[PDB]
Design a protein around this motif. Structure first.
Motif, PDB file in Angstrom:
ATOM      1  N   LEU B  94       0.833  -1.210   0.000  1.00  0.00           N
ATOM      2  CA  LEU B  94       0.000   0.000   0.000  1.00  0.00           C
ATOM      3  C   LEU B  94       0.865   1.256   0.000  1.00  0.00           C
ATOM      4  N   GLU B  95       1.908   1.265   0.831  1.00  0.00           N
ATOM      5  CA  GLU B  95       2.913   2.337   0.797  1.00  0.00           C
ATOM      6  C   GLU B  95       3.338   2.655  -0.649  1.00  0.00           C
ATOM      7  N   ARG B  96       3.234   1.669  -1.549  1.00  0.00           N
ATOM      8  CA  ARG B  96       4.046   1.652  -2.778  1.00  0.00           C
ATOM      9  C   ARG B  96       3.721   2.740  -3.782  1.00  0.00           C
ATOM     10  N   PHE B  97       2.520   3.306  -3.701  1.00  0.00           N
ATOM     11  CA  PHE B  97       2.282   4.625  -4.288  1.00  0.00           C
ATOM     12  C   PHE B  97       0.952   5.251  -3.860  1.00  0.00           C
ATOM     13  N   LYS B  98       0.621   6.336  -4.548  1.00  0.00           N
ATOM     14  CA  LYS B  98       0.521   7.644  -3.896  1.00  0.00           C
ATOM     15  C   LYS B  98      -0.746   8.035  -3.114  1.00  0.00           C
ATOM     16  N   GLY B  99      -0.986   7.398  -1.969  1.00  0.00           N
ATOM     17  CA  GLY B  99      -2.078   7.809  -1.077  1.00  0.00           C
ATOM     18  C   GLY B  99      -3.346   6.972  -1.176  1.00  0.00           C
ATOM     19  N   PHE B 100      -4.119   7.001  -0.087  1.00  0.00           N
ATOM     20  CA  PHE B 100      -5.308   6.183   0.081  1.00  0.00           C
ATOM     21  C   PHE B 100      -5.964   6.434   1.439  1.00  0.00           C
ATOM     22  N   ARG B 101      -7.260   6.150   1.523  1.00  0.00           N
ATOM     23  CA  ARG B 101      -8.023   6.369   2.748  1.00  0.00           C
ATOM     24  C   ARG B 101      -9.287   5.509   2.750  1.00  0.00           C
ATOM     25  N   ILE B 102      -9.631   4.937   3.906  1.00  0.00           N
ATOM     26  CA  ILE B 102     -10.983   4.413   4.133  1.00  0.00           C
ATOM     27  C   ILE B 102     -11.923   5.591   4.385  1.00  0.00           C
ATOM     28  N   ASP B 103     -13.060   5.569   3.704  1.00  0.00           N
ATOM     29  CA  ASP B 103     -14.099   6.578   3.849  1.00  0.00           C
ATOM     30  C   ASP B 103     -15.337   5.818   4.335  1.00  0.00           C
ATOM     31  N   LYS B 104     -16.510   6.410   4.171  1.00  0.00           N
ATOM     32  CA  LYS B 104     -17.744   5.799   4.638  1.00  0.00           C
ATOM     33  C   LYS B 104     -18.013   4.518   3.825  1.00  0.00           C
ATOM     34  N   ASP B 105     -17.188   3.498   4.072  1.00  0.00           N
ATOM     35  CA  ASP B 105     -17.179   2.249   3.305  1.00  0.00           C
ATOM     36  C   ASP B 105     -16.626   2.417   1.886  1.00  0.00           C
ATOM     37  N   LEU B 106     -15.558   3.198   1.730  1.00  0.00           N
ATOM     38  CA  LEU B 106     -14.931   3.376   0.409  1.00  0.00           C
ATOM     39  C   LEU B 106     -13.430   3.585   0.494  1.00  0.00           C
ATOM     40  N   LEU B 107     -12.651   2.557   0.192  1.00  0.00           N
ATOM     41  CA  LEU B 107     -11.211   2.729   0.184  1.00  0.00           C
ATOM     42  C   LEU B 107     -10.847   3.322  -1.152  1.00  0.00           C
ATOM     43  N   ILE B 108     -10.198   4.475  -1.163  1.00  0.00           N
ATOM     44  CA  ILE B 108      -9.812   5.048  -2.440  1.00  0.00           C
ATOM     45  C   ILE B 108      -8.324   4.924  -2.568  1.00  0.00           C
ATOM     46  N   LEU B 109      -7.866   4.052  -3.445  1.00  0.00           N
ATOM     47  CA  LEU B 109      -6.442   4.013  -3.690  1.00  0.00           C
ATOM     48  C   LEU B 109      -6.129   5.041  -4.758  1.00  0.00           C
ATOM     49  N   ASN B 110      -4.945   5.639  -4.666  1.00  0.00           N
ATOM     50  CA  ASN B 110      -4.481   6.584  -5.659  1.00  0.00           C
ATOM     51  C   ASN B 110      -3.080   6.207  -6.097  1.00  0.00           C
ATOM     52  N   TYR B 111      -2.893   5.987  -7.390  1.00  0.00           N
ATOM     53  CA  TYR B 111      -1.588   5.545  -7.885  1.00  0.00           C
ATOM     54  C   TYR B 111      -1.040   6.542  -8.873  1.00  0.00           C
ATOM     55  N   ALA B 112       0.242   6.417  -9.165  1.00  0.00           N
ATOM     56  CA  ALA B 112       0.892   7.264 -10.146  1.00  0.00           C
ATOM     57  C   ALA B 112       1.727   6.403 -11.114  1.00  0.00           C
ATOM     58  N   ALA B 113       1.369   6.365 -12.396  1.00  0.00           N
ATOM     59  CA  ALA B 113       2.008   5.437 -13.350  1.00  0.00           C
ATOM     60  C   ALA B 113       2.747   6.139 -14.491  1.00  0.00           C
ATOM     61  N   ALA B 114       4.048   6.308 -14.283  1.00  0.00           N
ATOM     62  CA  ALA B 114       4.971   6.743 -15.325  1.00  0.00           C
ATOM     63  C   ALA B 114       4.947   5.861 -16.589  1.00  0.00           C
ATOM     64  N   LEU B 115       4.996   6.546 -17.732  1.00  0.00           N
ATOM     65  CA  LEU B 115       5.520   6.077 -19.032  1.00  0.00           C
ATOM     66  C   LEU B 115       6.103   4.663 -19.096  1.00  0.00           C
TER      67      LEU B 115
END
Ligand code: NA
Lengths: 120, 115
Positions: B94-115
Motif C-alpha cells: 500500500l505504501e508503494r504509491f501515492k495515497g489512500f483512505r478508508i471513507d464511509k465504506d470506500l477505500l480510495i487508492l491513488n496511484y501514479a504510473a509513469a511512461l
C-alpha cells in the motif's frame, strides 16, 4: 471500480496510458477518434495472436493505400478496474502504436482534455 | 504521467477486498493495514508456483509483479503457514504509491504510473 484518471500530455502532443490487456502491459495512445482498441500487429503478436490465423474482415482505407484489419475481443483490459471483453481489432495497416478508443471509453462517465492534460 | 483512483466498496462481512494480478494470476486479498507484508495463503502461494515441499512462522517471498491498476514490481511478503484463511495485502504494497483512505465504506487508492 471506476476512477478519475489524469494523463499528462506527452512531449509528442498525445498521451498514452498503459493497460494490461490479458495481463500484458500494452502501451496505448488515447484516441477519441478511434472507434475501439486498435492493436498493432506487434502488440497483436505480443498478445499471442497469430497474424496468419486472424480473419481480416475490415478495411481502413488511407491516403497511402488499404490496411486490412481483424476483429477481436479483448478478454481483460486492466487500467485498474478490469474491463471484460472489450471490442477491438488487429490493424495490419501502418498502425505504428496501439489505440485506446471508444470501445473502452464509453464505459466511463465524464471527460476533459488539453492544455497538456487528458482527464477522464 | 498517469494518476488514478481505484474505489473499493466494503464487503457486508466488514472487510475491504482487492483482486490483483500477481505474476498474471488473480489472487483475492483482504486489505489489512495491520499487516506489513503481503501474506499469501499456502493455497495462494502455490497457485504462483511456490513449492511447499521446501519447508506458525513464515517463508519469505518476493512477488515479481502485482497489478491493481499500476503494476507494482518486486513486493515483499511471506506465505502464512497455519493462520491465513485469506491472503493479506499489507503495507509492503500500500505504501508503494501515492495515497489512500478508508471513507464511509470506500477505500480510495491513488496511484501514479509513469511512461
Ligand atoms: Na497504468
Amino acid at each position: 471500480e471506476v476512477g478519475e484518471i489524469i494523463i499528462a500530455r506527452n512531449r509528442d502532443g498525445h498521451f498514452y496510458i498503459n493497460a494490461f490487456v490479458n495481463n500484458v502491459k500494452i502501451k496505448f495512445m488515447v484516441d477519441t477518434g478511434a472507434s475501439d482498441i486498435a492493436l498493432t500487429k506487434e502488440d497483436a503478436q505480443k498478445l499471442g495472436f497469430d497474424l496468419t490465423k486472424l480473419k481480416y474482415t475490415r478495411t481502413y482505407l488511407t491516403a497511402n493505400g488499404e490496411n486490412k484489419a481483424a476483429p477481436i475481443t479483448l478478454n481483460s483490459v486492466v487500467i485498474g478496474k478490469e474491463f471484460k471483453n472489450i471490442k477491438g481489432h488487429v490493424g495490419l495497416g501502418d498502425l505504428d502504436i496501439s489505440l485506446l478508443g471508444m470501445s473502452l471509453l464509453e464505459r466511463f462517465k465524464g471527460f476533459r482534455i488539453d492544455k497538456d492534460l487528458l482527464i477522464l
